[PDB]
């Protein structure tokens, strides 16, 4: 009468075997909705910060990709002003074999190694491409401003 085995499995394994640097907790009303916190990756301009993310498992999951969005403001060429994430596996390259765990560490990997050259990157990409040193300092500035509380 409830959730598919896979979702039950992934949910319970999220809380039993947490990803390093990532907290992921169920919403109090919606069993397909999760509140995630990603630590800024070591040696990145986000290091020391913590970033809120939200994750939703659609009806058609795992045929359909999970929906994921940042809820902490972040300076990154592949995350827009509304927190939306440009990442292959969230759209074109999604396949059912991928777990939530894989998406989450991949997002972490994106923080660790931004792709300013991506066809879908925002206006922040231009800074990253041309004045990378300044852009990295600005990412660190925004980490101080928005991701330390």
């Amino acid at each position: 009468a409830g959730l598919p085995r896979r979702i039950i499995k992934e949910t319970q394994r999220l809380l039993a075997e947490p990803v390093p640097g990532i907290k992921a907790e169920p919403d109090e009303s919606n069993a397909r909705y999760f509140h995630v916190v990603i630590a800024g990756p070591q040696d990145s301009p986000f290091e020391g910060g913590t970033f809120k993310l939200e994750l939703f498992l659609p009806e058609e999951y795992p045929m359909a990709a999970p929906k994921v969005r940042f809820m902490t403001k972040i300076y990154h060429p592949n995350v827009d002003k509304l927190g939306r994430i440009c990442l292959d596996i969230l759209k074109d390259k999604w396949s059912p074999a991928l777990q939530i765990r894989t998406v989450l560490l991949s997002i972490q990997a994106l923080l660790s190694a931004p792709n300013p050259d991506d066809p879908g990157a925002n206006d922040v990409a231009e800074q990253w491409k041309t004045n990378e040193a300044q852009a990295i300092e600005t990412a660190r500035a925004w980490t101080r401003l928005y991701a330390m509380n």
């Binding site: 919403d27 939200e54 659609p58 509304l82």
Partner: protein, 140 residues
């Protein structure tokens, strides 16, 4: 019965707003393009032909609270309008007087609210109301 969480529903509405619907006589978008809470929206209604609202563009503010879309949004006109159910001094839309709001269902949306207000502009009791001068707006 799988519920799409508020934030994800609003993202759907954002994309649909950008794509537009129907004949474009209503439209909506985020008031602040950096508002990650997706709370405050701008609504637009073209006044319908053969009413006193005709050839006027109405701007609205639509507030999607923490319980949206389980709960209806709050709505107010910025552009001044004389219409049943709209407070003629402040522009606020009285939910009890607008059926889509008074009888809100979680399948509804900003689009639906705007289309309903446009339909109600065509009602016998509204279509003949004398209007304030074009271009005037309420305070606050």
């Amino acid at each position: 019965g799988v519920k799409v969480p508020r934030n994800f529903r609003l993202l759907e509405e954002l994309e649909e707003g950008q794509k537009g619907v129907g004949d474009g006589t209503v439209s909506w978008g985020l008031e602040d393009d950096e508002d990650m809470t997706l709370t405050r929206w701008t609504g637009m209604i073209i006044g319908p032909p053969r009413t006193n609202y005709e050839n006027r563009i109405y701007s609205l503010k639509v507030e999607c609270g923490p319980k949206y879309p389980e709960a209806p949004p709050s709505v107010r006109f910025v552009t001044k309008i004389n219409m049943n159910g709209i407070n003629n001094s402040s522009g606020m839309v009285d939910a009890r007087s607008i059926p889509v709001l008074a009888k809100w269902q979680n399948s509804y949306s900003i689009k639906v609210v705007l289309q309903e207000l446009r339909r109600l502009m065509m009602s016998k009791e509204n279509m003949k109301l004398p209007q304030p001068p074009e271009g005037q707006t309420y305070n606050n």
